[PDB]
Amino acid sequence: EALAYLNETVIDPKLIALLDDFGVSRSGRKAISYIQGNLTSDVIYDRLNKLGADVVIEKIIKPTVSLLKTKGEALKIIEDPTNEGVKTRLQNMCKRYDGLVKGIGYDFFHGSIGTDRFAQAVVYYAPRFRKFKEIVKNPRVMDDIYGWLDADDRATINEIGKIVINATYDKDKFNNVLNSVGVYYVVRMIDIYRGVKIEHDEALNAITTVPDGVVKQDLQARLNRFKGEYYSNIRGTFKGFTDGLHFQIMTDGDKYRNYFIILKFDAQAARVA
Amino acid sequence: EEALAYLNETVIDPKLIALLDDFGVSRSGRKAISYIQGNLTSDVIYDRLNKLGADVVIEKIIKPTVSLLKTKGEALKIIEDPTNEGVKTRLQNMCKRYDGLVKGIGYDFFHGSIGTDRFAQAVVYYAPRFRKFKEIVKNPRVMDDIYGWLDADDRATINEIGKIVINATYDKDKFNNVLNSVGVYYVVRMIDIYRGVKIEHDEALNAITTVPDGVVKQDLQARLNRFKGEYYSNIRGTFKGFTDGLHFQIMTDGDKYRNYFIILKFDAQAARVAK
């Protein structure tokens, strides 16, 4: 297809057998080699076999391909010799995003996230790659964290901001944390948060659905308990960062996301009873 | 101090000022204490400084910090030079990251996780890093590489860390990619931590040599080798796991191992006296 710049693909015949059997393109095989990262041929096979080729193609390959597309399109803007000044910097960021995506890959392959999440997660980087075009136009923007972020990204950090910024903690301490950790860690946080919020909201709907009173309110206890704990972690981590206690934003996102998921299922299961 | 004149910020809390006056701390010294204070409260740094005595405070806290701030001031002059408008911002941002890291050492010190020797040892790691701006402005492309920000000492340390990490399986390019992903802020901190462990291990080495050859020398010797092993293994593991997509932080658990070596040194010395 369009993604000619790749030229790195599966060589393992067993995987090749499941990819041909699944009926995906040369384009397809390439994309899988990309997100394969340094995970073995065999383990990529092991995950994929358990799932239907049907589910696989739309949930995994399609989304990956959308990304590789927009990355090809961004790569061009680096290659352009008008952008030689900003070239190396852009390539570096490209490598960071690459690692992050391959990580979402890793996470899906070893079973930590489902197909749905994988699809949802990988698309997060599409606007980030697309952002290169805009940045080149007036380069001074790169020395800021926000210079690298689309409006969905800014929206998400502005949400986290409203969670942490308060009387005692202002826009300045917050922005300072983000400038310290860098885009790499910032976007990772963004994604992790998005996950947590999505699953929290599904648990919300599911709980509303439960017949009024009896155990319904007991569920909303857990919902509120979990939300409080998570929001607390966000504040705790940012305060701790500004205070000098630690040098890393850690929200315990994955743990809380799983908590909301279990909760959603108990709410769906209690609607029925 | 004319070198600290760019600062414009110093202790306000009057009881703290009284204690610093009781100690002989200059104006500049006040300005330094205010600097490493960060967001800690005057009560906290008062509590710490009080139990220590003017001799130690002046020599291990104030003198090193003040030297550091003089350096940071030079670096600031390079930043604000109008020639360097084009890169001004990017340097200030690094300047801020470095502030944070220093205030962190401040923090560990005030809350008792490190003592005076470590504070003075660790805080001067940053002087080269600020000085480096002077060179960086002359050839701005260097900023696009993490090694562009490292001074000679930093380079040395990284090379050494590389030798611990690089394999037939894991090569110089992979190693360099994690450095670049993580950025200078995390890279320099891993360097300080590593240096602490390395320095403590050597102290523990000497202390074991001092033990009369014999009964418990071996048992201590085992610990030294085992500990070095465990640490070096943590380093390799964290880099591999990083390029493998397993995790997104370089973490060597270095503080834990610094303490292990310090305890080991103390045990070694108590053993010299007993035997």
Numbering used by the authors:
A (entry chain B): 163 to 435
B (entry chain A): 162 to 436
Question: Which text from the study accompanies this structure?
Answer:
One of the proteins identified in these studies was classified as BTA121. While BTA121 does not share appreciable sequence similarity to any known protein domains or motifs, its N-terminal region is enriched in proline, glycine, and glutamic acid and contains a potential procyclic acidic repetitive protein (PARP) domain that was previously reported as having roles in Trypanosoma brucei survival and successful replication in its insect vector, the tsetse fly. BTA121 is a completely helical protein separated into an N-terminal and a C-terminal helical bundle. BTA121 does not share structural similarity with known proteins, and has the characteristic palmitate-binding cavity observed in tablysin-15, and palmitate binding was confirmed in vitro.
Recombinant BTA121 was produced and the crystal structure of BTA121 was solved using Se-SAD phasing. The final refined structure was obtained by phase extension by molecular replacement into the 2.8 Å resolution data collected at 1.000 Å wavelength. A total of 548 amino acid residues and 13 sulfate ions have ordered electron density  forming  a dimer. The first 91 amino acids of BTA121 and N-terminal putative PARP domain are disordered for each monomer. The monomer can also be viewed as having four helical domains (D1, 164–214; D2, 215–299; D3, 300–344; and D4, 345–435). Domains D1 and D2 are in the N-terminal bundle while D3 and D4 are in the C-terminal bundle. There are two possible crystallographic dimers; dimer 1 has an interface of parallel helices; while dimer 2 interfaces through loops. The interactions at the dimer 1 interface are hydrophobic and have a palindromic sequence. BTA121 has a network of interconnected tunnels connecting the large cavities some of which contain sulfate ions from the crystallization solution. The channels and tunnels connect all the cavities containing sulfate ions. The presence of such an extensive network of tunnels and cavities suggests that BTA121 may bind small molecular weight ligands, including lipids.
